[PDB]
Structures are given as structure tokens and as C-alpha cells.
């Protein structure tokens, strides 16, 4: 299924029902399609007490898309603000804070020194379509994501290149061992809805 976020607001959003444990590494993958053109905004964000920008993917207005971990920034080589469906995976490891960015199964770059040695704080709130300024709230419409999201999954390891290809190709459907994409793990609010999603091939048409 897909989540539909049809309008730039500070009140429509999805909420992952599960929280995160303390992560020393992760992979976050998802399909997204954005209507919005001065920047896709914020497909997802993770806020904890102490730090509302604990994990954030945000392309705010006409700026380079950024990953925040613990409010520390890296620019990613994702190019997904073309109004078409795209699959993305981000991997990261506490060890030397090394990240990788994959788009449509292809690795587009890597970097180091993003929040190195910082474990991800457990217990926070994962929001779809909005950027958090408090745990679970204080949304900003100029940062909101407008469009559709599907197959948002989180694992607590760095998936291998080959696994990402298969996910991007949807020749795999194995759910995130931490955050699975299932109906009862994805609540919607304020106008956000859920719908059957086109097949992988239909999308990329």
C-alpha cells in the first residue's frame, strides 16, 4: 500500500506505530513520488526527547537534499524531485559515521563522519511526511512532503548492495526487521490516506 499526502500542510501525516531501539547501524529504504518542485520536503523524520532532528531526510525548498543524524548534516546524491516514483536506500553505521545512498538499486555515493560514534537514541517517534520540532509534533508546512510514499522499511544493519538491488527491483519483499511496512504499523492523520499501490513496473512507467 501507499500513503497519500496530497497537499502542503502542517496537519496531515503518517506515524509509524513502532519506535526504534538503540541503533549502531541501519538501512532505511522507501519508494517515494513527489509532486512538489521547490524540494521534496521531508518524507520521514525521527525525533527523541533531547533531539527532534535525530534522523531526518529533507530537501527544503530549493536546497540540496540533506540527511541529518543527531542534527549533523550530509548532502546526499539523491535526485528524486522529478515527480516520478523512485526507490531510495540509505545505509549508515556508527563506526566512523559512514553512509551510502542508493537510488533505484544503484549506489550514487558514500560519505564518512556523519554523527560518528553516535548510537541512534531509542524511544522516539517516526513521522511520515513532516519534519519534527518536538517529539511527534511542531510540524512546518514549508518542510512537508507532498506526494506518495510506499514500502518504508528499516533494518538494523547495512544491507548489502545485492539486497538493495532486489528490494529496488521488488524481486524481494522482506520487511525491515525493525520497521516493517504493514497496515497496522502505519497510522495516518489529518487527511493522509492509505491505498493499494501500483506494481513496481507500473510505477516506473
Amino acid at each position: 500500500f501507499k500513503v497519500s499526502l496530497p497537499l502542503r500542510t502542517n496537519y496531515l501525516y503518517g506515524k509509524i506505530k513502532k519506535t526504534l531501539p538503540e541503533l549502531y547501524a541501519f538501512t532505511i529504504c522507501l519508494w517515494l513520488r513527489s509532486s512538489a518542485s521547490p524540494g521534496i520536503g521531508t518524507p520521514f523524520s525521527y525525533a527523541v526527547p533531547g533531539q527532534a532532528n535525530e534522523i531526518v531526510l529533507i530537501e527544503w525548498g530549493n536546497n540540496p537534499i540533506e540527511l541529518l543524524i543527531n542534527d549533523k548534516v550530509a548532502q546526499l546524491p539523491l535526485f528524486v524531485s522529478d515527480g516520478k516514483w523512485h526507490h531510495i536506500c540509505i545505509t549508515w553505521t556508527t563506526r566512523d559515521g559512514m553512509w551510502e545512498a542508493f537510488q533505484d538499486g544503484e549506489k550514487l555515493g558514500t560519505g564518512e563522519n556523519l554523527a560518528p560514534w553516535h548510537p541512534i537514541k531509542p524511544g522516539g517517534v517516526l513521522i511520515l511526511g513532516q519534519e519534527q520540532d518536538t517529539v511527534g509534533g511542531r510540524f512546518d508546512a514549508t518542510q512537508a512532503f507532498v506526494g506518495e510514499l510506499s514500502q518504508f522499511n528499516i533494518w538494523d544493519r547495512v544491507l548489502r548492495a545485492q539486497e538493495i538491488i532486489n528490494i529496488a527491483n521488488c524481486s524481494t519483499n522482506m520487511p525491515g526487521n525493525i520497521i516493517p511496512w504493514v497496515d497496522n504499523n502505519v497510522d495516518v492523520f489529518g487527511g493522509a490516506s492509505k491505498w493499494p499501490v501500483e506494481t513496481c513496473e507500473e510505477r516506473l512507467l
Binding site: 536546497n63 540540496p64 541529518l68 548534516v73 555515493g109 560519505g111
Partner: protein, 121 residues
């Protein structure tokens, strides 16, 4: 004959300003034409600007950079500066200072500049 140290860099928000400085410990600074280069993540080190020994002439990589950056020097302080205005995220890079005279070229170790739209927001 030269040991350059850059400073003034750090975490800053988009739209903000910042002034780098580059200092020689020695006392023959005015022999040298001075320059700033920068290197962003997985990209080639690129020229920003240079300034003649006396500070009467300066050169920019292109008009976009010239529009927002100013190179200057103070030979009394053995220092070259880089004023950077209206900083963009794409200005994020290690900034390196560079001294040249005859066939001798010297470099500093660089100072980190990070410009983020989203950090803090």
C-alpha cells in the same frame, strides 16, 4: 619557508556569512601571491580566488563566487582573508589557503566549512 594555518571555519546556516583567515608564522608573507581553494565531498579541489603580493589585484574563479566572496590580505598581520556572504549549502567544503612565489608553492591543512539549510530547523 612557510607554514600556513587556516581558521574561521565551522557550522553555519544558509544565508549566513563567515570570514576565513590564513596566517603565516614566518615574516616573508609579502613575497607570496595568496589563494583560496576548496574541496567538497568526493569532488576535485577547486579555485576560489587569489590576490597579488601587495593586495592591489585579485582574481575569482567566476562571477557567482565573485558576487559573494571577497579575498583580502593584511601584510602587517601576515594574513590572508576570505569574506564569504549569503553562504549556500553547496559552499560546504574544506577551504585551503595557498601561497606561491617563483617555483615554490605552499598549502595549509584546510578549515572545514559546513553550510546546512536544515540543521537546527
Amino acid at each position: 619557508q612557510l607554514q600556513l594555518v587556516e581558521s574561521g571555519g565551522g557550522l553555519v546556516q544558509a544565508g549566513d556569512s563567515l570570514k576565513l583567515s590564513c596566517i603565516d608564522s614566518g615574516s616573508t608573507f609579502n613575497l607570496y601571491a595568496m589563494g583560496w581553494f576548496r574541496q567538497a565531498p568526493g569532488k576535485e579541489r577547486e579555485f576560489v580566488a587569489s590576490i597579488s603580493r601587495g593586495g592591489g589585484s585579485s582574481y575569482y574563479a567566476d562571477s557567482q563566487l565573485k558576487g559573494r566572496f571577497t579575498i583580502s590580505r593584511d601584510n602587517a598581520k601576515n594574513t590572508v582573508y576570505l569574506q564569504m556572504n549569503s553562504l549556500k549549502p553547496e559552499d560546504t567544503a574544506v577551504y585551503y589557503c595557498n601561497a606561491r612565489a617563483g617555483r615554490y608553492d605552499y598549502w595549509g591543512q584546510g578549515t572545514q566549512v559546513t553550510v546546512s539549510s536544515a540543521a537546527g530547523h
